[PDB]
């Protein structure tokens, strides 16, 4: 199936049972989410974007249900203005950019 | 043809004859380039990203050759750390995100 990019490529995902709207982003290396609580077992990180950088919390082997499939992967949480699924999860969902 | 996303989706483009490496990004609304000079006929803009926002110069109807095709479109220039082609040009190149 595919996304024709006249609108933002947005889907609903469940992270450890919690539902979240996410943007599927090929220019992101990694994924970052806000407004979800995931535990004390994290490593501190900083990710850089366009306007500067932010502090994040990296969680490994998190359970994610999206597009009729359940995968486990790395998620960061931090003060992002929008939630992003980056290339790390898009490869796990078998997505490609086609032309 | 397609890009499998284990590596960054990067191509070379010619903007008004000048060659530039660009990242094809589905989470960008628009495109922004640096290190190219495009004229005094621009409108001032500010784009926001992850770490904050930047000042840009918006140029309309610019000539772009990429993936064996020549298209005209809107490009901004500013102090981006990487050059991005956003959804505005990816639709004009007939790209979709497939799964």
């Amino acid at each position: 199936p595919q996304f024709h990019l006249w609108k933002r490529p947005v889907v609903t995902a469940h992270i450890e049972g919690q539902p979240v709207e996410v943007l599927l982003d090929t220019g992101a290396d990694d994924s970052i989410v806000t407004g979800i609580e995931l535990g004390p077992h994290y490593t501190p990180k900083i990710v850089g974007g366009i306007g500067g950088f932010i502090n994040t919390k990296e969680y490994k082997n998190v359970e994610v249900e999206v597009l009729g499939k359940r995968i486990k992967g790395t998620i960061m949480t931090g003060d992002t203005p929008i939630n992003i699924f980056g290339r790390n999860l898009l490869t796990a969902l078998g997505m490609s950019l086609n032309f | 043809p397609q890009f499998h996303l284990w590596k960054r989706p990067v191509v070379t483009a010619h903007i008004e004859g000048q060659p530039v490496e660009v990242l094809l990004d589905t989470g960008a609304d628009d495109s922004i380039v640096t290190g190219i000079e495009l004229g005094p006929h621009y409108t001032p803009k500010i784009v926001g990203g992850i770490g904050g926002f930047i000042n840009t110069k918006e140029y309309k109807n610019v000539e772009v050759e990429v993936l064996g095709k020549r298209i005209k479109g809107t490009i901004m220039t500013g102090d981006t750390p990487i050059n991005i082609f956003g959804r505005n040009l990816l639709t004009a190149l007939g790209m979709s995100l497939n799964f």
């Binding site: 290396d29 990694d30 990710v47 | -």
Partner: peptide, 4 residues
């Protein structure tokens, strides 16, 4: 664009 997002990176670590």
């Amino acid at each position: 664009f997002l990176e670590k």
